[PDB]
Design an enzyme around this catalytic site. Structure first.
Site, PDB file in Angstrom:
ATOM      1  N   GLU A  59      -8.487  -4.936  12.919  1.00  0.00           N
ATOM      2  CA  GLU A  59      -8.826  -4.787  11.533  1.00  0.00           C
ATOM      3  C   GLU A  59      -9.059  -3.376  11.081  1.00  0.00           C
ATOM      4  O   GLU A  59      -9.323  -2.490  11.838  1.00  0.00           O
ATOM      5  CB  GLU A  59     -10.051  -5.632  11.207  1.00  0.00           C
ATOM      6  N   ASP A  89       8.514   2.598  10.493  1.00  0.00           N
ATOM      7  CA  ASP A  89       8.137   1.332   9.844  1.00  0.00           C
ATOM      8  C   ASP A  89       7.709   1.542   8.371  1.00  0.00           C
ATOM      9  O   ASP A  89       6.696   0.993   7.923  1.00  0.00           O
ATOM     10  CB  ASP A  89       7.050   0.562  10.626  1.00  0.00           C
ATOM     11  CG  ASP A  89       6.953  -0.930  10.281  1.00  0.00           C
ATOM     12  OD1 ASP A  89       7.982  -1.520   9.840  1.00  0.00           O
ATOM     13  OD2 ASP A  89       5.860  -1.508  10.453  1.00  0.00           O
ATOM     14  N   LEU A 132     -10.429  -4.349   4.797  1.00  0.00           N
ATOM     15  CA  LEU A 132      -9.328  -3.805   4.009  1.00  0.00           C
ATOM     16  C   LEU A 132      -7.983  -4.381   4.449  1.00  0.00           C
ATOM     17  O   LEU A 132      -7.090  -4.555   3.627  1.00  0.00           O
ATOM     18  CB  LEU A 132      -9.287  -2.268   4.116  1.00  0.00           C
ATOM     19  CG  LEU A 132     -10.477  -1.490   3.575  1.00  0.00           C
ATOM     20  CD1 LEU A 132     -10.352  -0.025   3.924  1.00  0.00           C
ATOM     21  CD2 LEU A 132     -10.626  -1.666   2.071  1.00  0.00           C
ATOM     22  N   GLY A 133      -7.834  -4.615   5.741  1.00  0.00           N
ATOM     23  CA  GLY A 133      -6.593  -5.135   6.286  1.00  0.00           C
ATOM     24  C   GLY A 133      -6.722  -5.626   7.703  1.00  0.00           C
ATOM     25  O   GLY A 133      -7.739  -5.401   8.365  1.00  0.00           O
ATOM     26  N   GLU A 134      -5.684  -6.320   8.158  1.00  0.00           N
ATOM     27  CA  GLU A 134      -5.613  -6.862   9.503  1.00  0.00           C
ATOM     28  C   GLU A 134      -4.222  -6.653  10.064  1.00  0.00           C
ATOM     29  O   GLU A 134      -3.233  -6.971   9.402  1.00  0.00           O
ATOM     30  CB  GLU A 134      -6.010  -8.349   9.536  1.00  0.00           C
ATOM     31  CG  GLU A 134      -7.513  -8.542   9.654  1.00  0.00           C
ATOM     32  CD  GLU A 134      -8.029  -9.963   9.527  1.00  0.00           C
ATOM     33  OE1 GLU A 134      -7.569 -10.839  10.295  1.00  0.00           O
ATOM     34  OE2 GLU A 134      -8.931 -10.189   8.688  1.00  0.00           O
ATOM     35  N   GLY A 135      -4.166  -6.072  11.255  1.00  0.00           N
ATOM     36  CA  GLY A 135      -2.920  -5.837  11.976  1.00  0.00           C
ATOM     37  C   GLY A 135      -2.897  -6.594  13.288  1.00  0.00           C
ATOM     38  O   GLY A 135      -3.821  -7.362  13.570  1.00  0.00           O
ATOM     39  N   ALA A 136      -1.847  -6.377  14.111  1.00  0.00           N
ATOM     40  CA  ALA A 136      -1.699  -6.968  15.446  1.00  0.00           C
ATOM     41  C   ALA A 136      -2.907  -6.555  16.315  1.00  0.00           C
ATOM     42  O   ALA A 136      -3.541  -7.412  16.933  1.00  0.00           O
ATOM     43  CB  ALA A 136      -0.388  -6.512  16.077  1.00  0.00           C
TER      44      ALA A 136
HETATM   45  O1  LIG Z   1      -9.434  -9.088  -0.682  1.00  0.00           O
HETATM   46  C1  LIG Z   1      -8.470  -8.091  -1.041  1.00  0.00           C
HETATM   47  C2  LIG Z   1      -9.144  -6.740  -1.183  1.00  0.00           C
HETATM   48  C3  LIG Z   1      -9.123  -5.960   0.130  1.00  0.00           C
HETATM   49  C4  LIG Z   1      -7.706  -5.624   0.571  1.00  0.00           C
HETATM   50  N1  LIG Z   1      -7.352  -4.252   0.154  1.00  0.00           N
HETATM   51  C5  LIG Z   1      -6.079  -3.686   0.606  1.00  0.00           C
HETATM   52  C6  LIG Z   1      -6.274  -2.279   1.112  1.00  0.00           C
HETATM   53  C7  LIG Z   1      -6.993  -1.346   0.372  1.00  0.00           C
HETATM   54  C8  LIG Z   1      -7.265  -0.086   0.876  1.00  0.00           C
HETATM   55  C9  LIG Z   1      -6.812   0.278   2.143  1.00  0.00           C
HETATM   56  C10 LIG Z   1      -6.080  -0.640   2.893  1.00  0.00           C
HETATM   57  C11 LIG Z   1      -5.812  -1.899   2.368  1.00  0.00           C
HETATM   58  C12 LIG Z   1      -5.714  -0.047   4.221  1.00  0.00           C
HETATM   59  C13 LIG Z   1      -6.277   1.300   4.171  1.00  0.00           C
HETATM   60  C14 LIG Z   1      -6.937   1.492   2.920  1.00  0.00           C
HETATM   61  N2  LIG Z   1      -7.435   2.728   2.813  1.00  0.00           N
HETATM   62  N3  LIG Z   1      -7.104   3.350   3.984  1.00  0.00           N
HETATM   63  C15 LIG Z   1      -6.410   2.539   4.815  1.00  0.00           C
HETATM   64  C16 LIG Z   1      -5.855   2.943   6.065  1.00  0.00           C
HETATM   65  C17 LIG Z   1      -5.095   2.176   7.000  1.00  0.00           C
HETATM   66  C18 LIG Z   1      -4.687   3.008   7.957  1.00  0.00           C
HETATM   67  O2  LIG Z   1      -5.135   4.279   7.703  1.00  0.00           O
HETATM   68  C19 LIG Z   1      -5.851   4.206   6.548  1.00  0.00           C
HETATM   69  C20 LIG Z   1      -6.722  -6.661   0.063  1.00  0.00           C
HETATM   70  C21 LIG Z   1      -7.359  -8.046  -0.014  1.00  0.00           C
END
Ligand SMILES: O[C@H]1CC[C@H](NCc2ccc3c(c2)Cc2c-3n[nH]c2-c2ccoc2)CC1
Length: 266
Positions: free
Chosen positions: A20, A117, A13-17
């Site tokens: 993931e 932030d 879903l995401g990547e931070g410092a």
């Molecule tokens: O390939 C694309 C699809 C996957 C991605 N989707 C973005 C995204 C989509 C959904 C989510 C997040 C990000 C972070 C997140 C998400 N749901 N929950 C949380 C979270 C983070 C911290 O606490 C909860 C973008 C690239």
């Protein structure tokens, strides 16, 4: 019930410092949760939180050197991906998201927590497009035993940071979060950030202080939300509007958006 504690990591879903954020799906119930794979302050702050506009904390587990944070999955993704570059989004959508952002921020400030932030990458949306404040990695307690603590730590993201963080040694926590909310409102209505940072050396920031609103991004914004931005993006944090006063602003209380479309027949 056997296997109810087993979760499958289906996608990134995401990547931070830190690492993931993975989408985890329960083997038995098929419940979806976000797993943050990385800290001690973030868990302690997340344990305090319980609000409809704040990402839920389900628990944590440490597998040796790796810490796993179980958090709310928000299927709508990031607010960032709802902003069309150099355009923004429809004004009623921005107003609804700003109302929900204000509900989350009031809640956090009420329990003595500052996020530090706020930006569209950290504002997530659920299935019904409800805004949720996420990532408490930079968050801190600014009020304890009803005593306010002035901050001095410089953190956040430069286009969203308040000018006092760059000019003063100490500053109040709450006007800093209010400022970043006004930059989010600017991004939603104009699809662009007003400056690289809020400093005198920055031409775009100097133009704003000189009220050159015939320039971008300000010329794309209607006069009613722009009058609110004039009260939020005030350099002196002591003169800057507070959230109880944002709640009395004309645009903030302007009827613009219809409720979610319900099925109907004739
Ligand atoms: O390939 C694309 C699809 C996957 C991605 N989707 C973005 C995204 C989509 C959904 C989510 C997040 C990000 C972070 C997140 C998400 N749901 N929950 C949380 C979270 C983070 C911290 O606490 C909860 C973008 C690239």
């Amino acid at each position: 019930v056997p296997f109810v504690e087993d979760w499958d990591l289906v996608q990134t879903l995401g990547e931070g410092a830190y690492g993931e954020v993975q989408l985890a799906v329960n083997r038995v119930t098929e419940e979806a949760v976000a797993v943050k794979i990385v800290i001690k302050k973030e868990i302690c702050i997340n344990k305090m939180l319980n609000h409809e506009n704040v990402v839920k904390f389900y628990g944590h587990r440490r597998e040796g050197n790796i810490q796993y944070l179980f958090l709310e999955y928000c299927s709508g993704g990031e607010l960032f991906d709802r902003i069309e570059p150099d355009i923004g989004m429809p004004e009623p959508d921005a107003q609804r998201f700003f109302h929900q952002l204000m509900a989350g921020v009031v809640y956090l400030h009420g329990i003595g927590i500052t996020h530090r932030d706020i930006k569209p990458e950290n504002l997530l949306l659920d299935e019904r497009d409800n805004l949720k404040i996420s990532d408490f990695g930079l968050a801190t307690v600014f009020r304890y035993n009803n005593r306010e603590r002035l901050l001095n730590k410089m953190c956040g993201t430069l286009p969203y940071v308040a000018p006092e963080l760059l000019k003063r040694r100490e500053f109040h926590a709450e006007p800093v979060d209010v400022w970043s909310c006004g930059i989010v409102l600017t991004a939603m209505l104009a699809g662009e950030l007003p400056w690289d940072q809020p400093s005198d050396s920055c031409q775009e920031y100097s133009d704003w202080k000189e009220k050159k609103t015939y320039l971008n991004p300000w010329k794309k914004i209607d006069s009613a939300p722009l009058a609110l931005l004039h009260k939020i993006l005030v350099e002196n944090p002591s003169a800057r509007i507070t959230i109880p006063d944002i709640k009395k602003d004309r645009w903030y209380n302007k009827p613009l958006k219809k409720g979610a479309k319900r099925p109907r027949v004739t």
